[PDB]
Amino acid sequence: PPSYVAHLASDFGVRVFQQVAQASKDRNVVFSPYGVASVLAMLQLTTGGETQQQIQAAMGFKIDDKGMAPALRHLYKELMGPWNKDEISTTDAIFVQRDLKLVQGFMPHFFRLFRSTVKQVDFSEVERARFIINDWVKTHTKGMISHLLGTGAVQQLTRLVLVNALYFNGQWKTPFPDSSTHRRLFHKSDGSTVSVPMMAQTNKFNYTEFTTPDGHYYDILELPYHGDTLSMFIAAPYEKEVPLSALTNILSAQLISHWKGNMTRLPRLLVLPKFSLETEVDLRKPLENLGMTDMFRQFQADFTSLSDQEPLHVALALQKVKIEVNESGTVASSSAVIVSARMAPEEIIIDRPFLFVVRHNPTGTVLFMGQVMEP
Ligand SMILES: [Cl-]
């Protein structure tokens, strides 16, 4: 089902973000809970045996089950509809050795389910294979993501690669002014500060203070995008010794929903750092920690649904996310005569590390999720 599978998909991907985050420590990290959910669902089809059970358990749904793929493909068409003014461009690709004898009916079946095809390449032509892979991403992310560092691992022994790449760029329901954007010190998690550019805006924001069962307090602010189709939620720790990991490690779609129910509109002056960050992840370590170890093993991996004669296994599972946040009419050239604005009761300055979550409002899909430590 629709919002059902979107939630199983989002939750799984967040579970994947927790792993990437517990590894990144104090590095800025952008990730797409949706992306890794979309691709892993496709890979379910190329698996069999234990390698398949480990993934359907990790994700929480069999891709061949009634309404799973139909709901998933309906979702994709929704995100890529006409409202999306090139705000989010994505691409999911599975590259297998072309010389490999495939199972009778895998390609036809895969297409019917995803309306996409598994890519074939002759991995013996290393240079060609890598170019072909970094090129697919390019042409299919509207030229936003044209390279990968991980492809540098594709060699002769490679027979299978998984790739996922997303690009996201706002377009707020109410653009942050421009003349208001200014310099402001940001408190990095070590007492050190840096003069970073921040956007400012007074208006009626949807806010809520949030406490985790653990007792951590966060200022939660929802920031809508044009048409309320998307919303970027901001979870900024209360004091200063409050980590992001206290929230991100208990995060789910039901938690975002929770914020919405307790949310209220207060007239504040929001000061938000403008950030354009990029992260590339080697999904292997994080996927293994979620219980998916077999797929990465030379003798254990079981992809007999993609081909039954083979010593296969994913040689490279990765993701690349490019997130940008600005005024949306961002001249950005380092600042005329006047600047006016309506006054607000209080201000909410985001000058310390914080985490954000972008969601598809109609379905509550957790599209993007990050931890911004130093903009
Ligand atoms: Cl790139």
**Domain coordinates of the chain in residue numbers?**
30-167+278-322+333-342, 168-277+323-332
Q: How far apart are CA 134 and CA 127, in angstroms?
A: 11
In the structure, ligand 1 is a single-atom ion and the residues with CB under 5 Å from it are 145-147
51 alpha carbon to ligand 1 midpoint, in Å? Answer: 31
Q: Using the mean position of ligand 1's atoms as its centre, give its distance from the Cα of residue 97 in Å.
A: 24
Let me know: does 330 contact 177? Beta carbons within 8 Å: no
How far, in Å, from the CA of 236 to the mean position of ligand 1? 29
Rounded Cα–Cα distance for residues 353 and 37 (Å): 26
Q: Which residues pair with 207 in a beta bridge?
A: 221, 264
Question: Phi/psi at 174 (nearest 5 deg)?
Answer: -140, 100
> What are the two backbone dihedrals, phi and then psi, of residue 26, each rounded to the nearest 5 degrees?
-115, 25
With residues binned 3-state (H G I as helix, E B as strand, rest as coil), the percentages for the chain, rounded to 5, are 30, 30, 40
φ, ψ of residue 361 in degrees (nearest 5): -50, -45
How far apart, in whole angstroms, are the C-alpha atoms of residue 231 and residue 171? 10
Q: How far, rounded to the nearest angstrom, does the alpha carbon of residue 301 sit from its chain's CA centroid?
A: 26
Say what the alpha-carbon torsion angle 118, 121, 123, 128 is, to the nearest 10 degrees. Answer: -130
- Cα(129) to centroid(ligand 1), Å: 17
**By the 8 A CB rule, do 224 and 170 touch?**
no
Instruction: Calculate ∠ Cα 320-321-324, nearest 5°.
Output: 150
316 touches 158 (CB < 8 A) = yes
Residue 294 is classified by DSSP as: G
Beta strands in 59-98 (DSSP E): 88-97
* 189 Cα: distance to centroid of ligand 1 (angstroms): 28
Cα of 169 to ligand 1 centre, how many Å? 15
CATH topology of domain 30-167+278-322+333-342: Antithrombin; Chain I, domain 2 (3.30.497)
Sheet holding 275-281, edge to edge: 119-121, 88-97, 160-169, 316-325, 275-281
Distance 234 CA to ligand 1 centre (A): 26
Under 8 Å between Cβ of 344 and 269? yes
Give me ligand 1 centre to Cα 155, in Å: 20
**Do 25 and 81 contact (CB within 8 A), yes or no?**
no
Instruction: Tell me, in angstroms, the distance from the centre of ligand 1 to residue 147's CA.
Output: 4
Rg of the chain, C-alpha, whole Å: 22
Q: At CA 312, angle to CA 307 and CA 315, rounded to 5?
A: 130
This structure was determined by X-ray
Measure CA 4 to chain center: 19
CATH number of 168-277+323-332: 2.30.39.10
Structure resolution, Å: 2.4
From the CA of 151, how far away is ligand 1's center (Å)?
Answer: 12
**Cα three-residue angle 129-278-358, rounded to 5 degrees:** 115
Quickly count helices (H) and strands (E) in the chain: 9, 14
- The size of the chain, in residues, is 375
